[PDB]
Amino acid sequence: GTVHRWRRLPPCDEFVGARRSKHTVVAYKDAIYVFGGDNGKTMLNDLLRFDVKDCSWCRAFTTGTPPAPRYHHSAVVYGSSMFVFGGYTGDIYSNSNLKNKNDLFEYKFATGQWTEWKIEGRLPVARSAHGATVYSDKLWIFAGYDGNARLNDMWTIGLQDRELTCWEEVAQSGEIPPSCCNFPVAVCRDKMFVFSGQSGAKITNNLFQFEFKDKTWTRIPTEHLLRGSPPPPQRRYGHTMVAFDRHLYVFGGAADNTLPNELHCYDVDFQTWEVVQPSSDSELPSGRLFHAAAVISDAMYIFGGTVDNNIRSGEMYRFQFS
């Protein structure tokens, strides 16, 4: 209710869905849609719907054959439908039939229709922990882990006509980020942003922007911090980044030996960082990683994640932007 306030929303009871991490969160209308993840014993493919108005958790109604249970997958929005791509599929408990994926599924919110987009032609390498977003009527996927090495390629796919569309690989130019996985992606202005992420030997707290119009990567020279500005957030992986009113909000993740819960704000125009100050009456969320985030109206929603030890979480938190 207050500006810059963490409210603790009613968690998803195990009666509706198991506490999970490595899932996806999607905002559509006034509801949050949670898909997939890991409950600690097995991979999931159920679809959850949290209504922001009545704060009611709910096992969403579906019809078609859903995607195979998976985690470390992507989910994006395009019109009246959700799009799930990639992930990790198999049986955790028996450690068998494990493989990365490159399939593409559609979920029409209107009818609850699961429909696999069986795309012909050459496909991107099956991958997990990649980043994904929508821009100019196309689904953009970037980097990830394929089972052999971390990736840094980029592919697009038109989301208008299933029959006419096919995968294209983007010819990226500029200072491409090193091979990354388990990072968040956010689009602001006409640029796509990537902050930190598990890049193994080359892991740092560098902020990269990708100009969509000329396919050019750029490392943000935020070393200006030495000239008064606050330092960027500590390097991390498995964190969530959302954009709201030309500002990047980074939360959570696992940073070396810590699980910080400072809410970091990147002023994209001023090119400066900041740690947002929560309100005096805020219910602060505990440090977590492999959660997922979404924005409805002028608020950020945090659901799930692993919260210290290995306790998976079904908690839902809402940070009220200005």
Partner 1 sequence: GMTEYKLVVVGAGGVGKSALTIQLIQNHFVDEYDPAIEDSYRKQVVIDGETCLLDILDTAGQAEYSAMRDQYMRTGEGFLCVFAINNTKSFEDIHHYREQIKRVKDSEDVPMVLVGNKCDLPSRTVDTKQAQDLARSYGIPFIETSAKTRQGVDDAFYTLVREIRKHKEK
Rule CB under 8 A: which of 293-322 touch partner 1? 306, 310
The correct pick among 187, 203, 220, 299 for binding partner 1 (CB under 8 A) is 203
| Distance of alpha carbon 86 from alpha carbon 48, whole angstroms | 19
**What is the nearest approach in angstroms of partner 1 to the Cβ of residue 238?**
7
**Per CB under 8 A, 129 contacts partner 1:** yes
Establish if 128 lies at the interface with partner 1 (CB under 8 A): yes
For position 240 contacting partner 1 by CB under 8 A, the verdict is no
Q: How far is the CB of 203 from partner 1 (least distance, A)?
A: 7
Cβ 200 to partner 1, closest distance in Å? 3
Closer to partner 1 by Cβ: residue 96 or 280: 96
Residue 216, token pair as written in the block = 């050019």
Rule CB under 8 A: say whether 14 interacts with partner 1.
no
What's the 3-state SS for the chain?
CCCCEEEEECCCCCCCCCCEECCEEEEECCEEEEEEEECCCCEEEEEEEEECCCCECCECCCCCCCCCCEECCEEEEECCEEEEEEEEEEECCCCEEEEEEEEEEEEECCCCEEEECCCCCCCCCCEECCEEEEECCEEEEEEEECCCCEEEEEEEEECCCCCCCCEEECCCEECCCCCEECCCEEEECCEEEEECCECHHHCCCCEEEEECCCCEEEECCHHHHHHCCCCCCCCCEEEEEEECCCEEEEEEEEECCECCCCCEEEECCCCEEEECCCCCCCCCCCCCECCEEEEECCEEEEEEEECCCCCEEEEEEEEECC
Binding of residue 88 to partner 1 (CB under 8 A): yes
Q: Least separation, in Å, of the C-beta of 66 and partner 1?
A: 22
Task: Number of residues interacting with partner 1: please give it, by CB under 8 A.
Answer: 32
Q: Which of 97, 257, 280, 322 binds partner 1 (CB under 8 A)?
A: 257
CB of 201 to partner 1, least distance (A): 4
Q: Which of 112, 200, 230, 231 binds partner 1 (CB under 8 A)?
A: 200
Q: Tell me if 39 contacts partner 1 by CB under 8 A.
A: no
Among 198, 206, 222, 240, binds partner 1 (CB under 8 A): 198
Nearest to partner 1 of 31, 43 (CB atom): 43
Query: From the list 150, 191, 239, 264, which residue makes contact with partner 1 (rule: CB under 8 A)?
Result: 150
Instruction: Please pick, from the candidates 19, 20, 23, 72, the single residue that binds partner 1 as defined by CB under 8 A.
Output: 72
* Opening angle at CA 296, ends 292 and 298, nearest 5: 115
The footprint of partner 1 (CB under 8 A) covers: 21-22, 72, 88, 93-96, 98, 128-129, 144-145, 147, 149-150, 181-182, 198, 200-201, 203, 237-238, 254, 256-257, 259, 289-290, 306, 310
